[PDB]
Amino acid sequence: LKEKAIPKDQRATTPYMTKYERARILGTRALQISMNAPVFVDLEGETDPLRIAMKELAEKKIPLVIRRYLPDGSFEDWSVEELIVDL
């Protein structure tokens, strides 16, 4: 795994979050919220887990990282904090 892990200083993937990454991040976070995970943002009365996760993503309080797998087996770790959600 030491050989597989591309060091953070020379990642060569896009800094933008893909549509599939955003969809899975929202799904995963909404599923965790539905199972009584602690919330990292203040709620303004919303009760839907999906929109709670959307609010968490809007201000980047989701503590997950994407492990993007290159076709050779190597991977790059991009935190949700540093991924630019342009879409």
């Binding site: 060569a12 993937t13 549509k19 599939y20 955003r22 969809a23 899975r24 929202l26 799904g27 995963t28 909404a30 599923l31 919220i33 539905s34 199972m35 009584n36 009760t47 887990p49 999906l50 996760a53 993007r68 797998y69 290159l70 076709p71 790059e76």
Partner: protein, 513 residues
Amino acid sequence: RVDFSARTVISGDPNLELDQVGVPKSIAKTLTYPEVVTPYNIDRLTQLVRNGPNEHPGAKYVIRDSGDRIDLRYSKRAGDIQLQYGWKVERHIMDNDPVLFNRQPSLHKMSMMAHRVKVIPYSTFRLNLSVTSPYNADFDGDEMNLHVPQSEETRAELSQLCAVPLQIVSPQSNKPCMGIVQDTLCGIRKLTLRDTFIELDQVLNMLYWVPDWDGVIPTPAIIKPKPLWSGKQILSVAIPNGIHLQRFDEGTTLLSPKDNGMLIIDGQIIFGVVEKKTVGSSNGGLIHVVTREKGPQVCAKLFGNIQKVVNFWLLHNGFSTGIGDTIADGPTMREITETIAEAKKKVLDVTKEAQANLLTAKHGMTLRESFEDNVVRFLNEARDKAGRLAEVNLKDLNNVKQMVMAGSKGSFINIAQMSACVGQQSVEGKRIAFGFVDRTLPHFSKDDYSPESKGFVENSYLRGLTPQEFFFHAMGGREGLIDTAVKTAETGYIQRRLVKALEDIMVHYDNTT
């Protein structure tokens, strides 16, 4: 075969949003979604459990953490159930639930888009008119299927990846796959004509019908001696602010003598009759611009607003069609008959030349093939000329002409066949063959190559077909039906093979495929 699925007949609903689907109440009571009990939703889940499974909205099951499943039928005997955090309430699907919606001959992705539930009190699935084009679905008895996601991850990705607004522009040909169709498409053309003026009482109702109307009455195009609004001016309310579109048709200038073309500045229609080229599923049109400038949600809202206002105006204006729309006046019918007779005379002259062997064969084919090619070309151009005469005769108040002009339904060939001349009947790309010995029917003599002998139908549908023309037309129609039945199976097989071949191709993170 999977669970949590429904199937039933579909009906259209102009009063539904683009991404909504109307779900029958009994179907909504049968299908359920399991919702995890959370401090944020304990009260409403408790209320649904109290309501029970026999009335909507309500819950059908309670899945305890121990795995035991409390059936809400026969559970009222035990009394009220106290819910604990971490339990599951398997409850009826309510409004605004993401559901996958499919029509079975599913040939591309846009035939499996995701809708929002709207519970309705009847036995048919209800969907917007515009979304029927990607589904290739009519309302002549079509059935469609419904799949309910059963977890938060599937629900989230179904709403964020497969939603109807996200599929407006398709990758298949980089242009929108949904547009304005049929009645709305015809009413939008009738409404935006320069003649169309609206009085105050109807303007207020049309403005109120637009859900996102900002609440200001636009100044009328005409102020004295009577306040009148134009159709373009009221339709412009639906169009979002900040949209520019400029298309130049054939012969249009900056002034539009024919009112063709299209100029929209800042969401206001400066000029141009709105028709298929603007609000259809065409590249560079209004739908494409709005969805590439404001986002898919605003475009779906545009679909809804346009449909609502145009349907209201057309409801209170009216549109019909009848037998009188297929009738051309006397001189036009005289000219059509003259054209047909002249073309028949030309065919007779060519036949006379061919029978005298004075005809010279085209380089690359036999004499008979050249003769048949000439005859077919003459007859086809005859039918086209007669149809053009008939189309020119038709007035602007003609209903079939109006539908063709809007692009909603019909074509020039339909007008030609209904009014002027049905034309030349062909089987296997050739004229009607000699099924009998040297003749098509036992009512003709041997070796008859005349247009009427080998399947030219010089009568229109209005005038009616003679028995021989009727039989030849039946032969042509049978050929068409057989071709359709073969083509559907062949395309299905080819599509399966192609999909199996390419299923594993994917774009990776280094941009390679």
